[PDB]
Amino acid sequence: VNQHLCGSHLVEALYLVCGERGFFYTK
Amino acid sequence: FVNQHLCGSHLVEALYLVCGERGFFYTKP
Amino acid sequence: FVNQHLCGSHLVEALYLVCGERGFFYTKP
Amino acid sequence: NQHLCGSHLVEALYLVCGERGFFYTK
Amino acid sequence: FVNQHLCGSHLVEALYLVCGERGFFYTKP
Amino acid sequence: FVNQHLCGSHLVEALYLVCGERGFFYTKT
Amino acid sequence: GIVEQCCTSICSLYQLENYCN
Amino acid sequence: GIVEQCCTSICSLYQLENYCN
Amino acid sequence: GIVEQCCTSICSLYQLENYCN
Amino acid sequence: GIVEQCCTSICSLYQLENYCN
Amino acid sequence: GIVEQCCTSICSLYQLENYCN
Amino acid sequence: GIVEQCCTSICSLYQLENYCN
Ligand SMILES: Cc1cccc(O)c1
Ligand SMILES: Cc1cccc(O)c1
Ligand SMILES: Cc1cccc(O)c1
Ligand SMILES: Cc1cccc(O)c1
Ligand SMILES: Cc1cccc(O)c1
Ligand SMILES: Cc1cccc(O)c1
Ligand SMILES: Cc1cccc(O)c1
Ligand SMILES: [Cl-]
Ligand SMILES: [Cl-]
Ligand SMILES: [Zn+2]
Ligand SMILES: [Zn+2]
Known part of the structure; x- marks a missing residue:
């Protein structure tokens, strides 16, 4: 879920x- | 337009x- | 746990x- | 907005x- | 007002x- | 660290x- | 509700607390 | 574009999916 | 609930929908 | 102030950097 | 700092207030 | 991808510019 949460911040x-x-x- | 700019943030x-x-x-x- | 706290904010x-x-x-x- | 304001309220x-x-x- | 508050949220x-x-x-x- | 950057985003x-x-x-530092 | 009350004018942290369970 | 359709009106996630790759 | 199920692994929007009123 | 300069017309990251410590 | 005090265990709104001006 | 490169270590603004159109 770390990847998903980080991606939300990246976009x-x-x-x-x-x-x-x-x-x-x-x- | 700032309202448009902030709306796009929410769209992405x-x-x-x-x-x-x-x-x-x-x-x- | 802060990880759970921040995930919760993403869930709402x-x-x-x-x-x-x-x-x-x-x-x- | 009311919709985006709502996002911030939540x-x-x-x-x-x-x-x-x-x-x-x- | 509320628009300035929403703006501030994005600025920070x-x-x-x-x-x-x-x-x-x-x-x- | 990435986790610290993410935590700080929520803190601000x-x-x-x-x-x-x-x-x-x-x-x- | 909270939208009519807090998107029309700013709501203090106390006013927002009115909407907690 | 997406702004004209979703910033002047509320777009559901169904409506936003048309802008995905 | 949603924390143990959607914070340990990714939930589909369809899974998140179960938590809707 | 940052509100007067950036809440009606868009401030690029380059203009916003001027508000950094 | 605030990262050291609040990024492992949760800081309540009341503890976060210590970081305001 | 950006997740593999930017979620393991922090990407500078220059590295993020890699994803711009
Ligand atoms: C009144 C209001 C609107 C949006 C967010 C807030 O914290 C308060
Ligand atoms: C209409 C709209 C704007 C921003 C985000 C959304 O999910 C929907
Ligand atoms: C699994 C998960 C956690 C947080 C947000 C999401 O959209 C999905
Ligand atoms: C794709 C999609 C949009 C909105 C709600 C859902 O459960 C799923
Ligand atoms: C002009 C402006 C307002 C709010 C946030 C921004 O990134 C930019
Ligand atoms: C403890 C903590 C970390 C990040 C954000 C918060 O609201 C609280
Ligand atoms: C590396 C990284 C992750 C998330 C946000 C950023 O600005 C940078
Ligand atoms: Cl996060
Ligand atoms: Cl907004
Ligand atoms: Zn986050
Ligand atoms: Zn907003």
């Missing part, structure tokens, strides 16, 4: 870092 | 939960 | 999205 | 209510 | 991320 | 709510 950080470009999240 | 959290293994491309209008 | 946010109009009931054993 | 209730928890309905 | 999250080891001092207006 | 969210108008100073 929030990608949203801010990537600004107007957006990002691609994949497993 | 929801997409993460529903998309699971499929993942997703987030692009901005 | 998911229930908010999954239960929508029905809502839900959270209580710790 | 996070706040989780913290404020402790072991008691809460009941959430729309 | 972003400051946590970008400020790193330096940290940050936050106070309501 | 909790301090934002608990501290209200007062605010807080967050730092991580």
